[PDB]
Unconditional design. Structure first.
Length: 133
RNA sequence: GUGAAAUACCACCCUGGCGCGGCUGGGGGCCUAACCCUCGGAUGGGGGGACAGCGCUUGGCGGGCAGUUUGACUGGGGCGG
């Protein structure tokens, strides 16, 4: 990685677990990218893909616009928009989509459903952050 | 573009791997100081040595011992039924 990214992860704690208002404004500083950032915030899952009775999908439209499914390995995939909308239009949206997403949990899903969440970019670094609060 | 998956900087993951560290389980070697043996002598020497022995605990072999069980009918009883 470049010094774009060498100055990047010197300013973030994957070490310290963080909350989601804490981590909402840290998204637009850590992209040293040219261009074009669509933000991706990712979560590992508490479910088993090896049974498709527990499989998940659909298409919903987020509140302010562009600007979900499980793989066979069982993690989360979806873009929430363009970098676009500023830090507190993110925190506004940051509790929005997942509380819409959680609704789809199958019954035979064993254990804590959101295993972790790292706010990141299509271009950028990893902070340990909580979907919780 | 004839394979359906796209060959970007990123994450979140799969799979084996190595690395570091955290909680760690298992082996091996040496040591002596507990513990054990010993020494005309000993607050010491020599030998064994964290084994062995002993406590609590686990599962097992276990007539060497112990307590008992080992039915009724029945032309006696058993055998047979
Ligand atoms: Mg030795
Ligand atoms: Mg000795
Ligand atoms: Mg010695
Ligand atoms: Mg001695
Ligand atoms: Mg000695
Ligand atoms: Mg012992
Ligand atoms: Mg007897
Ligand atoms: Mg017996
Ligand atoms: Mg009696
Ligand atoms: Mg009789
Ligand atoms: Mg008779
Ligand atoms: Mg008779
Ligand atoms: Mg008779
Ligand atoms: Mg008889
Ligand atoms: Mg008989």
């Amino acid at each position: 990685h470049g010094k774009r990214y060498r100055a990047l992860l010197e300013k973030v704690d994957p070490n310290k677990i963080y909350t989601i208002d804490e981590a909402a404004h840290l998204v637009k500083e850590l992209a040293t990218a040219k261009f074009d950032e669509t933000v991706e915030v990712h979560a590992k899952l508490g479910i088993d893909p090896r049974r498709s009775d527990q499989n998940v999908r659909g298409t919903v439209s987020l509140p302010h616009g562009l600007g979900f499914r499980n793989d066979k390995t069982g993690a989360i995939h979806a873009p929430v928009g363009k970098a676009s909308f500023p830090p507190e239009k993110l925190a506004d949206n940051i509790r929005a989509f997942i509380r819409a997403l959680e609704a789809h949990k199958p019954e035979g899903a064993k254990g804590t459903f959101l295993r972790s969440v790292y706010v990141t970019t299509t271009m950028g670094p990893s902070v340990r952050i909580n979907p919780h609060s």
